[PDB]
Design a binder for this molecule. Structure first.
Ligand code: TYR
Lengths: 147, 147
């Protein structure tokens, strides 16, 4: 239950999460109060999960990023790992995945040596083997698609 | 230079990309005016690259997501795969990578059938083999970390 109007709103807020109510309204052809309340409704279903600035991770010191695939050293408990890694700040994304491994993490760090340290912390905190794939270059990312 | 006032700014805008030129200035102890200038220089210097609402993908009927690892078929052609795929719009992200594959894509799609399809189109449009990994669940995603 997402009408043409909501489609326009998220498509605009995807492209520009600081879009203003007045700007959105003159694009959907609605009043700024219609818009404000369509946006709150989108936000409280979980259609729009929050707004974030797209910060360039090299500018701030994360010069190495990596996908690390992780798999249980002992498969037996239900799977703690996303909970237990939630508090390592250098882990930015955690997905469970089909195939031989269980999760994939995107991870970002200052250097090669900071990467060895982090692999250790992950090995130990989630009791998990790791397979690492260094990212050499991001060509574009998060480009969200509303169809 | 990232004057650790600029540091408090990006932490603030990453967790909340709508936080307003004022509300910021409070928790950052500055004039609404100087807060406005930095932000303008921060986007100029490519430290903030943009603002995005973060849209839940199922909510828009992207029920299957996948990492897709690609490697070009003919090492003698110019290797321009990121550019040949850039027009296909359900590729959300494309990285080059030191692994077993040349690049990794994050891709979103309606269903398993739609993916098979996408992949046919990926193979033929860049000239690549595909190896893909299906995401069952996203535990968290873009948690941007600032040192
Ligand atoms: N790797 C498993 C799926 C799985 C995902 C997460 C887990 O914690 C465990 C298993 C498979 O392909 O069947």
């Amino acid at each position: 239950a997402l009408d043409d109007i909501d489609r326009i709103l998220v498509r605009e807020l995807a492209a520009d999460g600081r879009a203003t109510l007045s700007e959105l309204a003159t694009r959907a052809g609605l009043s700024v109060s219609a818009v404000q309340s369509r946006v709150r409704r989108l936000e409280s279903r979980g259609v729009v999960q929050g707004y974030s600035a797209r910060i360039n991770p090299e500018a701030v010191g994360h010069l190495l990023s990596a996908f690390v695939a992780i798999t249980p050293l002992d498969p037996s408990q239900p799977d703690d790992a996303p909970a237990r890694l939630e508090h390592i700040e250098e882990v930015e994304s955690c997905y469970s995945v089909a195939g031989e491994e269980s999760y994939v993490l995107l991870v970002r760090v200052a250097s090669a040596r900071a990467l060895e340290d982090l692999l250790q912390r992950i090995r130990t905190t989630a009791n998990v083997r790791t397979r690492s794939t260094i990212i050499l270059n991001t060509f574009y990312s998060d480009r969200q698609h509303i169809p």
